[PDB]
UniProtKB/Swiss-Prot annotation, chain A:
The keyword Metal-binding does not apply. SMART domains: Ribosomal_S4, S4. PROSITE patterns: RIBOSOMAL_S4, S4. This is Small ribosomal subunit protein uS4. PANTHER family: 30S 40S RIBOSOMAL PROTEIN (PTHR11831), SMALL RIBOSOMAL SUBUNIT PROTEIN US4M (PTHR11831:SF4). Pfam families: Ribosomal_S4, S4. It comes from Escherichia coli (strain K12).
Swiss-Prot record, chain B:
HAMAP family: Ribosomal_uS17_B. It comes from Escherichia coli (strain K12). Part of the 30S ribosomal subunit. The keyword rRNA-binding applies. Keywords: Antibiotic resistance, Ribonucleoprotein, Ribosomal protein, RNA-binding, rRNA-binding. This is Small ribosomal subunit protein uS17.
UniProtKB/Swiss-Prot annotation, chain C:
Disulfide bonds: none annotated. Part of the 30S ribosomal subunit. It holds the Pfam family Ribosomal_S20p. This is Small ribosomal subunit protein bS20. Residues 1-25 are annotated as: Disordered. The gene is rpsT.
RNA sequence: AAAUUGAAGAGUUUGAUCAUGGCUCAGAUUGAACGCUGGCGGCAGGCCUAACACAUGCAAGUCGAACGGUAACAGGAAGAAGCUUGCUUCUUUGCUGACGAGUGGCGGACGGGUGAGUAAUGUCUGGGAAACUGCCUGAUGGAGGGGGAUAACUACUGGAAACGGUAGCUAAUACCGCAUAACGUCGCAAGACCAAAGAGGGGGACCUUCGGGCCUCUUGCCAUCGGAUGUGCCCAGAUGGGAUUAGCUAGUAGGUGGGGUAACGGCUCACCUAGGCGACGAUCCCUAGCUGGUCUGAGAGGAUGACCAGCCACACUGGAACUGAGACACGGUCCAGACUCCUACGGGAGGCAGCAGUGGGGAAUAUUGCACAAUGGGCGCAAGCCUGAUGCAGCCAUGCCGCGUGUAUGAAGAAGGCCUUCGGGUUGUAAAGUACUUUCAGCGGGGAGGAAGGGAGUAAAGUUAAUACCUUUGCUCAUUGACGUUACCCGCAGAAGAAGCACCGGCUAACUCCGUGCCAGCAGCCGCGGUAAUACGGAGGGUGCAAGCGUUAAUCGGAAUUACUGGGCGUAAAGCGCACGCAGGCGGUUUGUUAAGUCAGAUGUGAAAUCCCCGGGCUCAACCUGGGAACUGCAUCUGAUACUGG
């Protein structure tokens, strides 16, 4: 129930940097970055009108590590709720606990935060939350358990994630390893390289 | 206090009873037209005081016969 | 019969049918008498059997065999049928 | 009779009883007249595991309904508590 | 405050274009079947056809506080034991705990199953008058004195057996009279008449025939008028198709009376009229249980009625009735008919469409399991006893939902596979190695909640003669789990036990090589295949999905392709050959009245659940759950008079 394959292949076919790796070396210096995977690299995939919507839905799915039956549900909630639907689809994929671990930088990547959660180590508020697709509300003070404060590989990600862009809709404390999801994240605090309104038009056929 | 219904008579050749046409005004559930629809009732009356072509005002009571449950009160516009 | 509580209330049924047919044909006999004396004009000899027929319907009602309105349709048909001789 | 009794709903191993005022011929989950409260024995703290319309469970006993034993224990709980 | 926020097109007629018109695909969906494949868990779903036939257990019992009694258990006081000087007989003794058979009271009319019939006898919505109503509850009164049989038993007898027959003895809350009798029935009246039953727990001293009257409370009985509750009945709307079915009906339509059920009534007879339904679709033929809802749809609409729940109908087919408050009765009764099984040939017995289960049909649907521990239900004052309803278990990927099969570094771009302009590109940072983590399964350890009550006491108080018994009220004591080696946390070990499927010509995301060469073959439409095939068959790479993936069956959408919202008729399918015309649809213009259409408000009803909005609880979701809008309707009383009808 997760993509177990190679990961630079999925950065390659989407043709962008989707942060599937750490940052210890850049994406360019580990593989070719424009060329599409397969025999037919350098045949540049200039593709149809439906294809530019499909390669836009798959980018925002493959960022977070969702499968399509979960993602269709995440669309239906964001058509049900009030407000917009781009600005209510990009809220639910940021409220996941497997993503508020990573945006606070308790883990190096987006598919390690799933292991830190789903190996029973990330207690929201004072009870362990094993299940990775939790819907973290505002003000929940997510911390790190004391069995997994002593890991080298969580502070190794702390020193890594202090060097990226720090977010605005969060408040991490460094030494105690304890976050605070403050408010719900706005539109432009999640980067606008996601063409937002091409995930609406697929499912709204 | 009582719930009468007007109507018009059709057949009163039988003894001590008339039959009354009542003319309700339905609206068709789809096409939006305003049709007429009629219902035919038996009306018991004593004294046999009604004929064809006459406007009566009936009211509901216990079943006097097999297919009959209505007795009249008055005969307005008594003639053709 | 397969259940003991069906056998027992199968033989508590004839023991009630025999009595409920005796004490009902008694009543129908005593109404047949006040219908025998009802076309022969005996206003002083139909009234006798009607006064013999007051308690033997107003008792078989109260012991639960007919209902009280059957015990009061008789005594308002026969009273008119007697007093209009 | 007519009687005030529980009637079980909810999910397996986690019950949730409503109370009903219904005819004691009829079934458990079946027909009733006035659904007048509930009883949630797997409630949490600071939420309400009982809520009984004690006006209606008086007006429906003055017209003669035998309150069954669990509803009687519920009234004994919530009136004193 | 919120309860909504909702609409996509493409291919195909011609050398080619526009137009009309079909056919086909994209998406959602399931009581689902089949193929390839398979780790776990949570909550729901599982004979759609043969209403076919059924072996085997099991699903309706209780009450000794209604009564005779002892068929056994086990204590008693006897006392005849071998007498051991203490006891381990047993007839006998119902005196006690209780209790096999039988009389009686209440329950089997509930709960449980299926949809054969049923086009209005049903169902849904809203109105009514002429009715009964066990248990529960309120008020006012009663509750005297007699009686006859009879099962159980005993004796004798028939029959293969089922089941009887005869003659004796015995009781009550079973059964029947007399008395009594009103606020009830009958009656304009005077008057006439109608019921019943006890038991139990305690008792001071008065009676005390040794049982008890006597006092006390608890519950039980009878009668009337009331309340709820369930049911019977009636009327106007609505609930498939057909006109290549256009005429049906004699108890049929109405009346006067007799009879009849609880009540009205052609409900059933006896007479007198000649009527009733029908083009707003009667009769007849085909098909079907309906509704809350469900799936789709932007909506209006179209199809459907499984699980949950309200109503009706049915119980081997075809009938009729008894008991009873309630049935014309699933696990009752008699009568035929078909089919099974026993028989001594005379005669008998049975009805899974209750939970399980075998045969059979079929593409296809489970275990002959545990427990009354909860919530219900029957009897019981109570304890307790029964409960295949229900609560949980077993099997199945059948559906919805969650998690896992590692995470991070890692370039010598390893080997091997394939492509190749013979330089290289590609699998591919993927594997290896190097460090890191242990959810789930695996072995251990601890341990929530579903459990309220009931019991044995003690304290006062309410009662009465009573400091008794009892009833409610505060406490103290030992207490009661089917699931259950439970949900759930903490320990041990090690990347170990956990990835498959469809497609790659266009529509539609993904391209090359070899092996066949109008053959073998694919196909949802257009088309491919005749030696360079991006379509057939293999491999390499690739894309979409994931404990699923695909193909067929079915509905809806796209289909504005049955169009009210929303289409056409000179040539594409389409204007009767032309007229006169009753039923039907529509009606210039002004004042006045009426309130039917219409419009506003209010009460009554539209059951719960589900859909939707804000909230709460199981680590989140599914699932569960509180309150409210919704249920576009329908009836009643008020109002309004512009338009339409009179
Ligand atoms: Mg899934
Ligand atoms: Mg009786
Ligand atoms: Mg009469
Ligand atoms: Mg508790
Ligand atoms: Mg929106
Ligand atoms: Mg076309
Ligand atoms: Mg062509
Ligand atoms: Mg297999
Ligand atoms: Mg059968
Ligand atoms: Mg058998
Ligand atoms: Mg016994
Ligand atoms: Mg029965
Ligand atoms: Mg049928
Ligand atoms: Mg009864
Ligand atoms: Mg008696
Ligand atoms: Mg008397
Ligand atoms: Mg008559
Ligand atoms: Mg029936
Ligand atoms: Mg039958
Ligand atoms: Mg009877
Ligand atoms: Mg049976
Ligand atoms: Mg018989
Ligand atoms: Mg069965
Ligand atoms: Mg079989
Ligand atoms: Mg077969
Ligand atoms: Mg088996
Ligand atoms: Mg139980
Ligand atoms: Mg049993
Ligand atoms: Mg499963
Ligand atoms: Mg190589
Ligand atoms: Mg484990
Ligand atoms: Mg417990
Ligand atoms: Mg393929
Ligand atoms: Mg393409
Ligand atoms: Mg193919
Ligand atoms: Mg060739
Ligand atoms: Mg070739
Ligand atoms: Mg193809
Ligand atoms: Mg449409
Ligand atoms: Mg349409
Ligand atoms: Mg179609
Ligand atoms: Mg057209
Ligand atoms: Mg033409
Ligand atoms: Mg012409
Ligand atoms: Mg003309
Ligand atoms: Mg006009
Ligand atoms: Mg009006
Ligand atoms: Mg509702
Ligand atoms: Mg919540
Ligand atoms: Mg007008």
């Amino acid at each position: 129930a997760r993509y177990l394959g190679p990961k630079l292949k999925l950065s390659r076919r989407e043709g962008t940097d989707l942060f599937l790796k750490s940052g210890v070396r850049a994406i360019d210096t580990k593989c070719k970055i424009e060329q599409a995977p397969g025999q037919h690299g350098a045949r540049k995939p200039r593709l149809s009108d439906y294809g530019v919507q499909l390669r836009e839905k798959q980018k925002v799915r493959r960022i977070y590590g969702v499968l399509e039956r979960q993602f269709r549900n995440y669309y239906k909630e964001a058509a049900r709720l009030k407000g917009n639907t781009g600005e209510n689809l990009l809220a639910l994929l940021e409220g996941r606990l497997d993503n508020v671990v990573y945006r606070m930088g308790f883990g190096a990547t987006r598919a390690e935060a799933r292991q830190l959660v789903s190996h029973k180590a990330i207690m929201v508020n004072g009870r362990v939350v094993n299940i990775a697709s939790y819907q973290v509300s505002p003000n929940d003070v997510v911390s790190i358990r004391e069995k997994a404060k002593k890991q080298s590989r969580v502070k190794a990600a702390l020193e890594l994630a202090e060097q990226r862009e720090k977010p605005t809709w969060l408040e991490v404390d460094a030494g105690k390893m304890e976050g605070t999801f403050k408010r719900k994240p706005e539109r432009s605090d999640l980067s606008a390289d996601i063409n937002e309104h091409l995930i609406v038009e697929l499912y709204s056929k | 206090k009582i719930r009468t219904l007007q109507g018009r008579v059709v057949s009163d050749k039988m003894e001590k009873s008339i039959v009354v046409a009542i003319e309700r005004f339905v609206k068709h559930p789809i096409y939006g037209k305003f049709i007429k629809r009629t219902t035919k009732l038996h009306v018991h009356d004593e004294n046999n005081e009604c004929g064809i072509g006459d406007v009566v005002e009936i009211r509901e009571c216990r079943p006097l016969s097999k297919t009959k449950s209505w007795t009249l009160v008055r005969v307005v516009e008594k003639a053709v | 019969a397969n259940i003991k509580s069906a056998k027992k209330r199968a033989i508590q049924s004839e023991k009630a049918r025999k009595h409920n047919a005796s004490r009902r044909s008694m009543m129908r006999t005593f109404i047949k008498k006040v219908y025998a004396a009802i076309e022969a004009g005996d206003k002083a000899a139909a009234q006798k059997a009607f006064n013999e027929m007051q308690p033997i319907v107003d008792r078989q009602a109260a012991k639960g065999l007919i209902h009280k309105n059957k015990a009061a349709r008789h005594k308002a048909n026969l009273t008119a049928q007697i007093n209009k001789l | 009779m007519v009687t005030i009794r529980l009637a079980r709903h909810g999910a397996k191993k986690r019950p949730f009883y409503q109370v009903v005022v219904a005819d004691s011929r009829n079934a458990r989950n079946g027909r009733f007249i006035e659904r007048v409260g509930f009883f949630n024995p797997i409630a949490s703290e600071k939420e309400e595991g009982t809520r009984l319309d004690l006006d209606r469970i008086a007006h429906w006993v003055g017209q003669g309904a035998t309150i069954s034993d669990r509803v009687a224990a519920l009234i004994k709980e919530v009136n004193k508590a």
